[PDB]
Design an enzyme around this catalytic site. Structure first.
Site, PDB file in Angstrom:
ATOM      1  N   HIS A   1     -13.381   0.879  -8.362  1.00  8.24           N
ATOM      2  CA  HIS A   1     -12.606   0.791  -7.581  1.00  8.24           C
ATOM      3  C   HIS A   1     -12.337  -0.445  -6.844  1.00  8.24           C
ATOM      4  O   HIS A   1     -11.078  -0.834  -6.541  1.00  8.24           O
ATOM      5  CB  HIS A   1     -12.038   2.159  -6.963  1.00  8.24           C
ATOM      6  CG  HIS A   1     -10.448   2.215  -6.456  1.00  8.24           C
ATOM      7  ND1 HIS A   1      -9.491   2.188  -7.464  1.00  8.24           N
ATOM      8  CD2 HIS A   1     -10.035   2.502  -5.136  1.00  8.24           C
ATOM      9  CE1 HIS A   1      -8.485   2.198  -6.906  1.00  8.24           C
ATOM     10  NE2 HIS A   1      -8.572   2.407  -5.396  1.00  8.24           N
TER      11      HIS A   1
ATOM     12  N   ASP B   1     -14.327   2.605 -13.124  1.00  3.42           N
ATOM     13  CA  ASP B   1     -13.950   3.133 -11.821  1.00  3.42           C
ATOM     14  C   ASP B   1     -13.992   4.831 -11.724  1.00  3.42           C
ATOM     15  O   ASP B   1     -13.417   5.600 -12.400  1.00  3.42           O
ATOM     16  CB  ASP B   1     -12.068   3.178 -11.951  1.00  3.42           C
ATOM     17  CG  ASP B   1     -11.484   3.152 -10.561  1.00  3.42           C
ATOM     18  OD1 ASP B   1     -10.640   2.038 -10.239  1.00  3.42           O
ATOM     19  OD2 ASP B   1     -11.834   4.117  -9.745  1.00  3.42           O
TER      20      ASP B   1
ATOM     21  N   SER C   1      -4.645   0.432  -5.886  1.00  6.16           N
ATOM     22  CA  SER C   1      -4.785   1.997  -5.531  1.00  6.16           C
ATOM     23  C   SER C   1      -3.302   2.714  -5.295  1.00  6.16           C
ATOM     24  O   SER C   1      -2.459   2.433  -6.204  1.00  6.16           O
ATOM     25  CB  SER C   1      -5.723   2.252  -4.506  1.00  6.16           C
ATOM     26  OG  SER C   1      -6.661   1.332  -4.243  1.00  6.16           O
ATOM     27  N   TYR C   2      -2.924   3.244  -4.105  1.00  7.47           N
ATOM     28  CA  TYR C   2      -1.495   3.718  -3.876  1.00  7.47           C
ATOM     29  C   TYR C   2      -0.630   2.673  -4.131  1.00  7.47           C
ATOM     30  O   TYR C   2       0.423   2.862  -4.491  1.00  7.47           O
ATOM     31  CB  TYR C   2      -1.640   4.435  -2.608  1.00  7.47           C
ATOM     32  CG  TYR C   2      -0.437   5.360  -2.628  1.00  7.47           C
ATOM     33  CD1 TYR C   2      -0.292   6.817  -2.565  1.00  7.47           C
ATOM     34  CD2 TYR C   2       0.997   4.890  -2.324  1.00  7.47           C
ATOM     35  CE1 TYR C   2       0.391   7.728  -2.670  1.00  7.47           C
ATOM     36  CE2 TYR C   2       1.963   5.699  -1.998  1.00  7.47           C
ATOM     37  CZ  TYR C   2       2.024   7.353  -2.378  1.00  7.47           C
ATOM     38  OH  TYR C   2       3.036   7.948  -2.422  1.00  7.47           O
TER      39      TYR C   2
ATOM     40  N   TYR D   1       0.803  -1.136  -0.052  1.00  5.85           N
ATOM     41  CA  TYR D   1       0.084  -0.121   0.017  1.00  5.85           C
ATOM     42  C   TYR D   1       0.933   1.095   0.219  1.00  5.85           C
ATOM     43  O   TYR D   1       1.308   1.838  -1.058  1.00  5.85           O
ATOM     44  CB  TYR D   1      -0.894  -0.086   1.335  1.00  5.85           C
ATOM     45  CG  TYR D   1      -1.625   1.254   1.504  1.00  5.85           C
ATOM     46  CD1 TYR D   1      -1.514   2.161   0.702  1.00  5.85           C
ATOM     47  CD2 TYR D   1      -2.893   1.250   2.465  1.00  5.85           C
ATOM     48  CE1 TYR D   1      -2.385   3.316   0.819  1.00  5.85           C
ATOM     49  CE2 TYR D   1      -3.272   2.240   2.944  1.00  5.85           C
ATOM     50  CZ  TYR D   1      -3.416   3.487   1.997  1.00  5.85           C
ATOM     51  OH  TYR D   1      -4.260   4.413   2.272  1.00  5.85           O
TER      52      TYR D   1
HETATM   53  N1  LIG Z   1      -9.089   4.971  -2.325  1.00  2.44           N
HETATM   54  C1  LIG Z   1      -7.806   5.215  -2.706  1.00  2.44           C
HETATM   55  C2  LIG Z   1      -6.731   5.855  -3.259  1.00  2.44           C
HETATM   56  C3  LIG Z   1      -6.387   5.860  -4.546  1.00  2.44           C
HETATM   57  C4  LIG Z   1      -5.497   6.333  -5.302  1.00  2.44           C
HETATM   58  C5  LIG Z   1      -4.413   6.718  -4.021  1.00  2.44           C
HETATM   59  C6  LIG Z   1      -4.443   6.608  -3.006  1.00  2.44           C
HETATM   60  C7  LIG Z   1      -5.548   6.220  -2.441  1.00  2.44           C
HETATM   61  C8  LIG Z   1      -5.737   5.916  -0.917  1.00  2.44           C
HETATM   62  N2  LIG Z   1      -6.404   4.743  -0.414  1.00  2.44           N
HETATM   63  C9  LIG Z   1      -7.254   4.459   0.482  1.00  2.44           C
HETATM   64  N3  LIG Z   1      -8.050   5.504   1.080  1.00  2.44           N
HETATM   65  C10 LIG Z   1      -7.249   6.694   1.806  1.00  2.44           C
HETATM   66  C11 LIG Z   1      -8.156   7.225   2.733  1.00  2.44           C
HETATM   67  C12 LIG Z   1      -9.083   8.141   1.923  1.00  2.44           C
HETATM   68  C13 LIG Z   1      -9.925   6.776   1.176  1.00  2.44           C
HETATM   69  N4  LIG Z   1     -10.632   7.632   0.189  1.00  2.44           N
HETATM   70  C14 LIG Z   1      -8.956   6.077   0.544  1.00  2.44           C
HETATM   71  N5  LIG Z   1      -7.535   3.293   1.003  1.00  2.44           N
HETATM   72  C15 LIG Z   1      -7.091   2.246   0.594  1.00  2.44           C
HETATM   73  C16 LIG Z   1      -7.289   0.811   1.102  1.00  2.44           C
HETATM   74  C17 LIG Z   1      -6.452  -0.285   0.589  1.00  2.44           C
HETATM   75  C18 LIG Z   1      -5.383  -0.150  -0.339  1.00  2.44           C
HETATM   76  C19 LIG Z   1      -5.111   1.138  -0.796  1.00  2.44           C
HETATM   77  C20 LIG Z   1      -5.956   2.393  -0.341  1.00  2.44           C
HETATM   78  C21 LIG Z   1      -5.618   3.617  -0.941  1.00  2.44           C
HETATM   79  O1  LIG Z   1      -4.664   3.790  -1.712  1.00  2.44           O
END
Ligand SMILES: N#Cc1ccccc1Cn1c(N2CCC[C@@H](N)C2)nc2ccccc2c1=O
Ligand SMILES: *[C@@H]1O[C@H](CO)[C@@H](O[C@@H]2O[C@H](CO)[C@@H](O)[C@H](O)[C@H]2NC(C)=O)[C@H](O)[C@H]1NC(C)=O
Ligand SMILES: *[C@@H]1O[C@H](CO)[C@@H](O[C@@H]2O[C@H](CO)[C@@H](O)[C@H](O)[C@H]2NC(C)=O)[C@H](O)[C@H]1NC(C)=O
Ligand SMILES: N#Cc1ccccc1Cn1c(N2CCC[C@@H](N)C2)nc2ccccc2c1=O
Ligand SMILES: N#Cc1ccccc1Cn1c(N2CCC[C@@H](N)C2)nc2ccccc2c1=O
Ligand SMILES: N#Cc1ccccc1Cn1c(N2CCC[C@@H](N)C2)nc2ccccc2c1=O
Ligand SMILES: *[C@@H]1O[C@H](CO)[C@@H](O)[C@H](O)[C@H]1NC(C)=O
Ligand SMILES: *[C@@H]1O[C@H](CO)[C@@H](O)[C@H](O)[C@H]1NC(C)=O
Ligand SMILES: *[C@@H]1O[C@H](CO)[C@@H](O)[C@H](O)[C@H]1NC(C)=O
Ligand SMILES: *[C@@H]1O[C@H](CO)[C@@H](O)[C@H](O)[C@H]1NC(C)=O
Ligand SMILES: *[C@@H]1O[C@H](CO)[C@@H](O)[C@H](O)[C@H]1NC(C)=O
Ligand SMILES: *[C@@H]1O[C@H](CO)[C@@H](O)[C@H](O)[C@H]1NC(C)=O
Ligand SMILES: *[C@@H]1O[C@H](CO)[C@@H](O)[C@H](O)[C@H]1NC(C)=O
Ligand SMILES: *[C@@H]1O[C@H](CO)[C@@H](O)[C@H](O)[C@H]1NC(C)=O
EC number: 3.4.14.5
Lengths: 724, 728
Positions: A698, A666, A588-589, A505
């Site tokens: 997503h 998405d 995601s990230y 992540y």
């Molecule tokens: N979603 C999304 C997203 C998309 C692109 C870049 C960064 C993120 C952040 N993020 C995330 N939350 C971050 C806090 C606000 C909430 N909207 C999303 N949760 C999880 C959970 C599991 C694995 C990755 C992530 C993650 O990357």
């Protein structure tokens, strides 16, 4: 003799039992049959039979009892929108009269519904406007007449506020006794729209074009207004009058956000506001004036919270916890050492005094009573990845009791908590390292009333299956602890070499090394495929103070990427890792970092999988992106925006095996982002593997999609590791 | 030693190692042509010096995509700033150069973003379309005369086709037709007001922050089609004081009765024009013959002159009703129509009559009429040796139809069996192009004595390079089914051993009137698979294929996705029965219609194929365009053919894909077969829990023709095939 298989994961053969309760008083709570329970003894009986609403006609998705218990709201026709937002139909049931209410009903396609905190007042949002019902069967009063689809949102959030600010669709805040209804108004008139195709059912001849106001980095943001209306003085002849509460002057000078709403008392409300450059936030304290019917927020009562090294809050400034009289409050802010601890503020002075300290952090304030403050922290054993409930004595701060540390130190090191309406009782939830355990407690003496669910049913089954274990530990790097975890295959032999999969992540304030028990994809890979799956919290990760968390400020796609490569280098030197078979994957990230890693040219990783990755920060939303990156302008941070793309690393992908996956619908990380990655890879002649998912978003969370994706990844990974 | 050790590699194919040389020429008179530096080669003698040095436009400051010389040779038209739209349509800047005053015309320049320009057939008159409106220049340096004022983007098209007309009717963007001496400008005008739009994302260069939604009026099966009107303007009675008057020619009553198409425009004389209209149910077509009335200044299509072509077996024409070739006096014409036997031959028509008379007959077909003088009709056909996949030039005497001479059959019988022809302005000379089985050969001919004048291009450079490389060979033959002959070809690996078991790839198109088995020489992906990978790649023309008569061609009428699918499977069964095929390794691939057939084959549950690749496949006929689809399928209404529409989707076969390995490829910016169709296939395979391989191409269209994308998809496909066949 049998292993935890991919099928096992996909069909949930081994179900983790929960114990979800919803408190209704200070000694009673509900439980899904829908029966009532007593915290004291456990008596009473039933509230609603399994099929009393058999003669309803529709299938009930969720229920909501009014605070006074006189009415139950029934939700059906559930249509998901974004992550938290959705649409539903609603009916109200008179619990005394035992009948569905049929006059002045709640309309179809209602966006949000909420009871007042006490009694049975009701506020709902329909077609982006707010409505109020004093009684469930009387005509509702219209509060707002300005709501327009995709343009004006009254009492509900737009896309970006939903996902990135409130983690909720609702933008309605009742005062504690139901007198005042406070709400936010979002304006998206000039926010550009994201457009994408939605193919839908085979029957759809021409694809639908979806449109949402969505602000990408440096674009025109929604603006926000805040109102408060008096429901006790509602008129059925004249329109409701809404008093506005304007942002502070330090906010109105440029783009800003409303980032927190919290009622202090019956006539006092706190508002937190955040500049678009998210390193400066202000809290207004607003009292109701009876001479004017207006709200006054004394400039002298403003509380400033800022950061010289990064943004403010973990993802936003922390929420306040008010003492009953509302002249004081506690909230988590980071100290001069950069660690997030509880600060005590007096409403009418500048200085707050810290009530906790040390090289660990407070996660949340759970409840405050007359005598005690309750909070969860990772203090126990200096382990950032554990969570324990603590009690701090108000009259003496040094008097701190750990209420969960030793309840079962071996199987339980990660707790959350749910207190009763007035904190006389609390349910503890333990999430690991052993199987989850739900216990009930009396806060008067802190002994345990009973075990609510112990998961022995699951425990019996896991007796026959060869299960993996978890190693939680740290490595030293530049005189600093960095934590990692490993899902180790059963009968782990440290003289044999295992293929390793790095699970990533690694976004700001992420934590992927903890003491939580999970049954997931990693579980199958370890159990059946004898692959080690590791995670690592490097720079930018959370709950270890600002020194580590702010390390990637303005510099995304640098240190947190470098550190994942380093973790892998370190794991190779652990002796049991086959360094010809190291892989990396993330969502995601994590998809972003996986891609950045694979295109770095390190030579460390044979292959990887990126799922719905960001590819370039200008493509992602303003709130999240700008918090860490600033604006993509020449007078701010454009150069790093340009340097931190995955596209610019396409040439190095020649060195690795890549699988890129993305759902075509998405709304969050737009398909755009993968489209530009594939284009860049094509343009330099790199061969790779792809998979789109039609109409998946997503989450890629449809039952069948979910199964298809994990199966596809299994084959890719197994292929990469020469596993039959 | 000195034995061939090289093979034809993937890199050779992708990087163009072995290049076929062409010989592109343009006739300007009845004895002169142009070629590339521009030289005006003389057909007879050869005294022909440079017409335009390559340096003449160094000072231009823009790259020149293309050029056009006015028929009188006084002006040249320079095309620059070319931006592709669809298959034929595009946008470009133009400038005119004075070939005598030796300088660029700087006054009254043609605008940027011009959609089409065209010279009159004589002199140097000009007609261009800009912002969907027609404009005329009598002289290049003078202001333009605006002909139309109704042009609206995506709604009203004057002088240019809309999407479906461009792709499925005219195979061209242009909808302007000059009268033979340039007096009249005939044009079609299309109306899309009610035609639904397809919308799709275009991502563009990575600097684009927000994706673009492209939209185009595109009629899917059964949807509201575009309407079409036809006009004629006299370009000599133009005035700069009054708006230009355009004379409408209405459609025959039999067409105005419902939804119809304009499917052919052909000038007979200076004052006579022929139109062909087609009903939406494409089994009925009517030719109108319209004479210019001199006193009223109007056009008259006399009802008595109407010629009706129809069919009770399928649709009319191979893809549209065939084009007429008028005699000099315009009182008579020749055109290709199918006879009593179902075979397509040249019929001779008189304007004031009912029934025609066939000048050719047999169990073969005429491919095209290429030229007609007052004494001879020139045509290409597949008669020679009764080989449908062959092509030769023939000459039939107008006064004696028993006097038919083959002009190309024996020129080089061994290396040459597939010809096309380019005649001089009045057919006094002709270039012959031989495309196989040997290396392409270009020759020049005098039509008075029929003897060869010279060898224009013999591809000897390529023949040198090939001496040393183990090239594949071709097997062109047939098999008998229901006592009917069906042709196949095989690209066979070098040193082919009939006692071995080779893996086989089935290369498929198999759409109505397709031909995949022929005598053409090709350097393509298949060449590499055979030469380097030792895979036999075969192709088979079963029911539905063309050039063999309506009996075979109409076999799939109203039944798309039936026999043509069934015949490809049966073909694979025959090949394995031939004894040199490993039937544990039989694959199949195709593009467009061939993608659909591949998909339908892989979902057949036949058990014959291990794997396959569908590139840009149709998945369900309601997704594809009305003109192509309804031709074979009729309307998707309950009272027409909806049943078989619903019964011929690949989606409904998804379950059967558990037996095969499937690679599904599609470009995201495909305006032809919309990405939609593959997205529906994937969702269906996902819904029944079938694993498969996928690849999207960002911003590529139906061709996936970008240099980098082209190399990528063929490399990607090569991996998948090698994988399937366990090749190292
Ligand atoms: N979603 C999304 C997203 C998309 C692109 C870049 C960064 C993120 C952040 N993020 C995330 N939350 C971050 C806090 C606000 C909430 N909207 C999303 N949760 C999880 C959970 C599991 C694995 C990755 C992530 C993650 O990357
Ligand atoms: C939402 O914000 C928009 C954008 O500023 C406001 O629209 C403006 O309204 C004023 C007064 O009606 C006009 O003079 C401007 O021309 C409008 N701008 C645009 C671009 O539309 C709108 O008033 C706001 N809506 C509400 C009621 O708060
Ligand atoms: C193209 O066709 C449309 C019909 O699809 C025409 O629209 C009609 O125009 C007439 C005359 O102005 C109106 O009376 C009708 O209301 C319109 N009907 C419909 C169904 O839209 C349109 O005028 C045509 N365009 C041109 C210039 O030929
Ligand atoms: N957009 C759109 C759209 C276009 C044409 C007709 C109907 C809709 C409604 N709609 C939708 N909108 C709901 C209203 C607020 C708007 N921002 C999004 N979002 C999604 C999202 C996913 C799958 C379908 C839909 C959908 O049908
Ligand atoms: N669509 C659209 C569109 C939207 C916003 C700005 C400009 C355009 C123009 N345009 C375009 N149109 C040209 C005019 C007739 C119309 N039917 C298609 N087609 C394509 C096709 C492929 C890649 C880009 C484009 C493009 O930019
Ligand atoms: N294109 C296309 C297309 C798309 C979907 C279904 C059928 C077709 C027909 N078609 C085709 N032309 C047929 C004549 C009209 C022209 N528009 C296309 N040409 C080729 C060429 C090579 C391999 C396949 C095909 C093919 O399937
Ligand atoms: C259990 O609780 C209910 C709550 O209403 C109470 O009425 C009752 O007296 C209790 N019964 C017993 C037997 O403990
Ligand atoms: C909601 O919609 C359904 C179906 O259209 C209809 O029967 C019902 O009356 C509606 N309910 C309300 C409260 O409007
Ligand atoms: C709720 O608060 C309001 C505002 O302070 C007050 O006027 C009212 O008395 C309260 N209502 C009740 C019944 O407690
Ligand atoms: C907030 O961030 C900007 C840009 O990074 C910086 O220049 C400024 O000093 C910061 N402001 C505060 C209050 O620290
Ligand atoms: C072109 O060639 C012919 C034939 O030999 C010759 O007579 C003539 O002079 C040449 N043209 C000129 C005028 O250069
Ligand atoms: C075409 O565009 C170029 C660049 O914008 C300009 O210099 C030229 O004058 C234009 N020509 C016409 C005739 O519009
Ligand atoms: C030609 O027709 C157009 C539209 O019908 C009109 O606006 C224009 O003024 C006409 N031209 C002249 C000046 O006659
Ligand atoms: C072209 O044909 C028209 C119509 O028949 C005629 O009036 C005209 O004279 C011809 N032009 C020339 C230059 O012969």
């Amino acid at each position: 003799a049998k292993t935890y298989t991919l099928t096992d994961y996909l069909k949930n053969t081994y179900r983790l039992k929960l114990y979800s309760l919803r408190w209704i008083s200070d000694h009673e709570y509900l439980y899904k049959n829908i029966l009532v329970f007593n915290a004291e003894y456990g008596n009473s009986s039933v509230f609603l039979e399994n099929s009393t609403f058999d003669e309803f006609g529709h299938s009930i998705n969720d229920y909501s009892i009014s605070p006074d218990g006189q009415f139950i709201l029934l939700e059906y026709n559930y249509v998901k929108q974004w992550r938290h937002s959705y649409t539903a139909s609603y009916d109200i049931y008179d619990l005394n009269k035992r009948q569905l209410i049929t006059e002045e009903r709640i309309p179809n396609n209602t966006q949000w519904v909420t009871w007042s905190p006490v009694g049975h007042k009701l506020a709902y949002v329909w077609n982006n406007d707010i409505y109020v019902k004093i009684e469930p069967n009387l005509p509702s009063y219209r509060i707002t007449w300005t709501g327009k689809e995709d343009i004006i949102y009254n009492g509900i959030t737009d896309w970006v506020y939903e996902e990135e600010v409130f983690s909720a669709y609702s933008a309605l805040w009742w005062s504690p006794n139901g007198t005042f209804l406070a709400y936010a108004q979002f304006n998206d008139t000039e926010v550009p729209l994201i457009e994408y195709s939605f193919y839908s059912d085979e029957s759809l001849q021409y694809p639908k074009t979806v449109r949402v106001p969505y602000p990408k980095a440096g674009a025109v943001n929604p603006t926000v207004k805040f109102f408060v209306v008096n429901t006790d003085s509602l008129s059925s002849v004249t329109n409701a009058t809404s008093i506005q509460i304007t942002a502070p002057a330090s906010m109105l000078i440029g783009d800003h956000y409303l980032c927190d709403v919290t009622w202090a008392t019956q006539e006092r409300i706190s508002l937190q506001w955040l500049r678009r450059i998210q390193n400066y936030s202000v809290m207004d304290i607003c009292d109701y004036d009876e001479s004017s019917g207006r709200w006054n927020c004394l400039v002298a009562r403003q509380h400033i919270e800022m950061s010289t090294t990064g943004w403010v809050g973990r993802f936003r400034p922390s929420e306040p916890h008010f003492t009953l009289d509302g002249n004081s409050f506690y909230k988590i802010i980071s100290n001069e050492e950069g660690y997030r601890h509880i600060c005590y503020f007096q409403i009418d002075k500048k200085d707050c005094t810290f009530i906790t300290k040390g090289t660990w952090e407070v996660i949340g304030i759970e409840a405050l009573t007359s005598d005690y403050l309750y909070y969860i922290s990772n203090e126990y054993k200096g382990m950032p990845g554990g969570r324990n409930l603590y009690k701090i004595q108000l009259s003496d701060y040094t008097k701190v009791t750990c209420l969960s540390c030793e309840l079962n130190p071996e199987r339980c090191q990660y707790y959350s908590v749910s207190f009763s309406k007035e904190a006389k009782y609390y349910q503890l939830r333990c999430s690991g390292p052993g199987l989850p355990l739900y216990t009930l407690h009396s806060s008067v003496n802190d002994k345990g009333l009973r075990v609510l669910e112990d998961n022995s049913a699951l425990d019996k089954m896991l007796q026959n299956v060869q299960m993996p274990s978890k190693k939680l530990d740290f490595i030293i790097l530049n005189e600093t602890k960095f934590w990692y975890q490993m899902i180790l295959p059963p009968h782990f032999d440290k003289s044999k070499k295992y293929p390793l999969l790095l699970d990533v992540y690694a976004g700001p304030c992420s934590q992927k090394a903890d003491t939580v028990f999970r049954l997931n994809w990693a579980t199958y890979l370890a159990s059946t495929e004898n692959i080690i799956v590791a995670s690592f919290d490097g720079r930018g990760s959370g709950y270890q103070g600002d020194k580590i968390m702010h390390a990637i400020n303005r510099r995304l796609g640098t240190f947190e990427v470098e550190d994942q490569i380093e973790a892998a280098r370190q794991f190779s030197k652990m002796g049991f890792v086959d360094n010809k078979r190291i892989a990396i994957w993330g969502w995601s990230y994590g998809g972003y970092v996986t891609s950045m890693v694979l295109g770095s040219g390190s030579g460390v990783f044979k292959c990887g999988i990126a799922v719905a990755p960001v590819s370039r920060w200008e493509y992602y939303d303003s709130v999240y992106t700008e918090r860490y990156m600033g604006l993509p302008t020449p007078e701010d941070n454009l150069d790093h925006y340009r340097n931190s793309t995955v596209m610019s690393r396409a040439e190095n992908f020649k060195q690795v095996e890549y699988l890129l996956i993305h759902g075509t619908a998405d709304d969050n990380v737009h398909f755009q982002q993968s489209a530009q990655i594939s284009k860049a890879l094509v343009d330099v002649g790199v061969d790779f593997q792809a998979m789109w998912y039609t109409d998946e978003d997503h989450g890629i969370a449809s039952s069948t999609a979910h199964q298809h994706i994990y199966t596809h990844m299994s084959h890719f990974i197994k292929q990469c590791f020469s596993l039959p």
